[PDB]
Each structure stands twice: as C-alpha cells, then as structure tokens.
Amino acid sequence: AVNGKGMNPDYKAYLMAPLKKIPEVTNWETFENDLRWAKQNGFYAITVDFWWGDMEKNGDQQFDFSYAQRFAQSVKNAGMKMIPIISTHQCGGNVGDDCNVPIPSWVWNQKSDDSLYFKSETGTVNKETLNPLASDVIRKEYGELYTAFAAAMKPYKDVIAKIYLSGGPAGELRYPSYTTSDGTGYPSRGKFQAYTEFAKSKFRLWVLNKYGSLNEVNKAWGTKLISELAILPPSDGEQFLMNGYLSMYGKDYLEWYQGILENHTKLIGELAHNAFDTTFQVPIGAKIAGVHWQYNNPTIPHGAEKPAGYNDYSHLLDAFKSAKLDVTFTCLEMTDKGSYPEYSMPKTLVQNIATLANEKGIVLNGENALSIGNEEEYKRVAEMAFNYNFAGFTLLRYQDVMYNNSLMGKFKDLLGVTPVMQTIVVKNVPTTIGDTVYITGNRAELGSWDTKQYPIQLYYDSHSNDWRGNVVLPAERNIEFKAFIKSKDGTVKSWQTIQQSWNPVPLKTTSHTSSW
Numbered sequence: 001a002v003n004g005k006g007m008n009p010d011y012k013a014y015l016m017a018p019l020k021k022i023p024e025v026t027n028w029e030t031f032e033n034d035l036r037w038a039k040q041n042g043f044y045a046i047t048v049d050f051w052w053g054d055m056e057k058n059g060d061q062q063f064d065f066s067y068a069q070r071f072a073q074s075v076k077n078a079g080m081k082m083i084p085i086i087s088t089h090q091c092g093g094n095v096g097d098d099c100n101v102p103i104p105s106w107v108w109n110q111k112s113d114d115s116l117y118f119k120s121e122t123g124t125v126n127k128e129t130l131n132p133l134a135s136d137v138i139r140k141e142y143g144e145l146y147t148a149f150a151a152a153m154k155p156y157k158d159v160i161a162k163i164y165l166s167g168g169p170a171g172e173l174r175y176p177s178y179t180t181s182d183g184t185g186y187p188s189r190g191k192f193q194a195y196t197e198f199a200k201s202k203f204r205l206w207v208l209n210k211y212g213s214l215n216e217v218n219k220a221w222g223t224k225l226i227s228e229l230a231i232l233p234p235s236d237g238e239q240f241l242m243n244g245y246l247s248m249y250g251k252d253y254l255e256w257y258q259g260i261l262e263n264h265t266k267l268i269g270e271l272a273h274n275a276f277d278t279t280f281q282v283p284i285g286a287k288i289a290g291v292h293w294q295y296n297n298p299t300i301p302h303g304a305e306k307p308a309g310y311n312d313y314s315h316l317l318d319a320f321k322s323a324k325l326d327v328t329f330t331c332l333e334m335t336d337k338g339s340y341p342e343y344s345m346p347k348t349l350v351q352n353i354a355t356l357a358n359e360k361g362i363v364l365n366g367e368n369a370l371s372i373g374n375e376e377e378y379k380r381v382a383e384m385a386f387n388y389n390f391a392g393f394t395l396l397r398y399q400d401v402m403y404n405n406s407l408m409g410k411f412k413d414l415l416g417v418t419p420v421m422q423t424i425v426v427k428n429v430p431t432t433i434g435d436t437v438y439i440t441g442n443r444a445e446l447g448s449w450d451t452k453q454y455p456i457q458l459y460y461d462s463h464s465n466d467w468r469g470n471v472v473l474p475a476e477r478n479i480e481f482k483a484f485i486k487s488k489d490g491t492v493k494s495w496q497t498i499q500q501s502w503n504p505v506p507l508k509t510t511s512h513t514s515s516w
C-alpha cells in the first residue's frame, strides 16, 4: 500500500441488500440461506436501506419498523450481521434504482414556503430528500426517526454492526445536481440547487452576517450591488463554473453552499449519536458521492462536483471528523479517462479522497458505483481498497453475486478476505548505508508488483542482522512476492534472487523466512 504500509487490518467486506423489501425478491427462509452463503464467501454483514417512506408513511410519529425487525430477525437466524441505513431519501430516480419509495408525502406540508425542497438554476424542483437548509425540520424529524428506530431495534442490537445515515439524494451527502429532469445527468455539468426563495434568503443573510452591510459586501467582492436583494446565487451557472468561482464572490458562494452540507453532517451526526450510542454503541457513518465526470474539463473545472456541493474535500471531511462519522466513498471500481466529453477521473478522485481521510484519521469505507459483471472491476476495487487503507468495501448489489456462482467466487478470492498479521523475514540482504528494504507481490494486498508507490517496507533488525516486517495479508490466499532494495534516492537497486510464495497465507499468525 501507499506509504510503505499494507492492507487495513480492520478490513471487512459488506453486501448491499436489494432496494426493494426481501419478500418482493425472494422469501425469508431462502434469504437466510443466502446470508449464510454470503458469510461463507467472506461477507461480514449486509447493508440495508430502511426507507423513511416505509417507516413513517401515514403521518408524523406514525411509525412502522416491522419490516426492519423482521429483516433483523432473519439476519439473526442466519448468524449474520447487518448495517441499517436510515434512508431519509427517496428510492427511485437514481442510477441502478429498481424501486419507488418517496419520503413521507406529509413532510412537505410541514412548511408553507419553499424551504423544504430544492430548485435548480433553471427552476427544476427536486423533492428526493429534505433541503438541509431546513435544519429545524431536520432536527425534529430525523431526531424522532432515529430515536424511534433505536427503540424498536434495541432487541436486535446483537446483529447491528454499524449504522449509516442518509445525508442527501441516494443516501449521499450532496445536492441533487445531476438528474434527468434538470438535464444534468452524467456526464453533463451539474446545476446549482440553491434557487428556492428560502435558499436565496439564507445566502443573503449569511453574506450580510459575514460582512455586516451591503457596503462592506460590495467592498469585499468588488461589486456595485444596488440593494441587498441583488445578493444572489449564480445567475449563470455555466459562467460561474468557467470563471466566476475564482472571484471573492465565488469563494464566498461556494463556502456557503458547501458549508450547508458540512453543518448538515454535524447535525445528523449529533442526532444519530444521541439516539444510538447508548443503545447500540456502534460506529456511525455517512456517504460521499464519487462525482467523477467533468473533473478535468478545461472550460468548467470540476463542473459536476461543485454543483453537487463538493468544492473542498479537505474541508468537507473535517466535518465528518467533527461529527464522529465514518466516511464511505461510493465509486472505487473505475479507471481514469479524463477525455472529452466526460472528463472522467474516478480513480484520481478516490485516491485524493482516501489520502485526505487517512491523513485526518477518518475511518474510510468504499463501494462500487455500478454493478460489477467482470473480475477486472474486482481487481480495480482491490487495488484501491488494499493500497489506500480502506477499512471496508460494500458491494452493490445483492443479486449480482448471489445469483452468479462464478462472480461470487471471484469476489471471495479477491475481496472477501480476512486480514491476518504475518511476519516477513528476509536474510542476507546486501544493503548499504541509506538503503531501505521492501517487499512487493502479485496480489493487490501486496501492491501488485508496484515498487514505486505500493511496496510494503521492511525494517532492519540489528539483533539478527536481517530485515523484517509485520504485514497484514489475506488469510488462506496464495501469494507470490519478492523483497527488493531502494537506495537513498528512492531508486530500486536490486531484487531478491528467487520469487517467494505462501500457498496459502496461513490463517494463524506466524512467519515466513527466506534468504535474499
């Protein structure tokens, strides 16, 4: 892995349940057998969307957690674990969606203004999830839902390994900037979603709070606004993305725009910990979307991410740290393209995100954005998961591997692995002052023969005059590896004579000793 490290010892593989209720896909008894099959293939737990639309459909405080309890019961019967997602967003309308569960229709009647939903640059209304600006409504509703959910599920604490929160559309903390109705679906630029009167008012008040008066606003932005009502979000999204973002106005607008998501993150994290820490005491997390298109568009740099709300990932992740929420990035199986017209750089995106997360000490989890039908995508996921310190990987989705033994087997081999500590010892290494020693191998867990950025470092043992390292390896998987030497300048000086192997890596911690 990067930084002379290896795979994360806490790595776990997860399986996404279907979007629709289990009975609409199969039966509970078969489902229990599926779970056992999943566990046998290296899956630690099943993640599942519990839709707000299903749990509080009829009206405020009219809960129904029976499906969830029933699901949990079967999970318990299979001797499995589960990760509930309190899906406060609509199922249907997003990529891969095979469902139709809008959030409770009554919620939209909690306000007479337009504070609850989103409106795009062109007026497209979106009601997939509550507008995070309506923090008062969010605090109440989410607080009540989380609290009631905790009580109803308390007797199933034993099978709940983690709890996920939904920070926006598709269960991700972002704005609904890429949708078919708004004409912003991949791979087009996204449209900003701050055009409801309420959003314009909030931005206006935020700006005036920051500078005090319009006169000071005009001084800071170098503008000549005639009235406070002239303080508005971008009137021309395209022009803003081309050059407007560079101005002090642009920086302020984006700070506010992303800031809303950061505050929302802190709010839901607070509400979740209050409702769950005592009852379950398990990690809590939220998701960030991989908006990889328009990444390197020369004309509109990161033209899809900024409208989605992603302007500064470092700053965004800090909010997750403050809220004590683990992060899941949802797009690891893709390769960089960076070519017209999509300007897609998903791999670069994931690496940057993973790097920030690791630096900040944020538990990082990953998912594949689209269904995987080939082993190559699994290898791409593995390269990212095992070289960028991911603590977990969740496969979308259930059916793809449950009904494809071939694919299921590839997954077990490459991603359904159990990490195990092992000591690697290499003797008679002809190193000189300044040299460092590393090992690299065939599997992703070993850096896939990369010597530049993914090798695993070994350390000299002056007591035994050899080089050693405690490495995390995939249990019961065959491996091939070789130690090699890097000079002070970082140049690879030489390699170990014979290629080593472990067929397979022992389940119990031990050591592998070989000579250079």
Ligand SMILES: OC[C@H]1O[C@H](O[C@H]2[C@H](O)[C@@H](O)[C@@](O)(O[C@H]3[C@H](O)[C@@H](O)[C@@H](O[C@H]4[C@H](O)[C@@H](O)[C@@H](O)O[C@@H]4CO)O[C@@H]3CO)O[C@@H]2CO)[C@H](O)[C@@H](O)[C@@H]1O
Pocket (backbone or CB within 6 Å): 016, 017, 019, 049, 085, 087, 089, 090, 091, 092, 094, 095, 096, 097, 169, 170, 171, 172, 178, 185, 186, 287, 289, 290, 291, 292, 330, 331, 367, 368, 369, 370, 396
């Ligand atoms: O069961 C959990 C949730 O499952 C669904 O949400 C998934 C979604 O299906 C999945 O695609 C994803 O990854 O999120 C991002 C993704 O990271 C982005 O890349 C992008 O997807 C685009 C593709 O990358 C691109 O190649 C092309 O296909 O266009 C895609 C969409 O424009 O956008 C999505 C955001 O939706 O993760 C989520 C979260 O698990 C389901 O929708 C959701 O309701 C469930 O909660």
Ligand SMILES: OC[C@H]1O[C@H](O[C@H]2[C@H](O)[C@@H](O)[C@H](O)O[C@@H]2CO)[C@H](O)[C@@H](O)[C@@H]1O
Pocket (backbone or CB within 6 Å): 223, 225, 230, 231, 232, 233, 234, 235, 236, 239, 240, 241, 243, 244, 245, 247, 249, 250
């Ligand atoms: O709120 C002030 C004005 O903001 C926008 O205008 C921005 C524009 O979005 C940006 O691309 C450019 O670089 O700067 C101007 C401000 O000088 C709105 O479009 C205007 O209607 C607002 O008055």
Ligand SMILES: OC[C@H]1O[C@H](O[C@H]2[C@H](O)[C@@H](O)[C@H](O)O[C@@H]2CO)[C@H](O)[C@@H](O)[C@@H]1O
Pocket (backbone or CB within 6 Å): 449, 482, 495, 496, 497, 499
């Ligand atoms: O680059 C992929 C191959 O890496 C190694 O091959 C090394 C070899 O170990 C070393 O002794 C020699 O000097 O250089 C080659 C090429 O870098 C693995 O041993 C191979 O299995 C990989 O395919």
Ligand SMILES: [Ca+2]
Pocket (backbone or CB within 6 Å): 060, 061, 140, 141, 144, 145
């Ligand atoms: Ca309520």
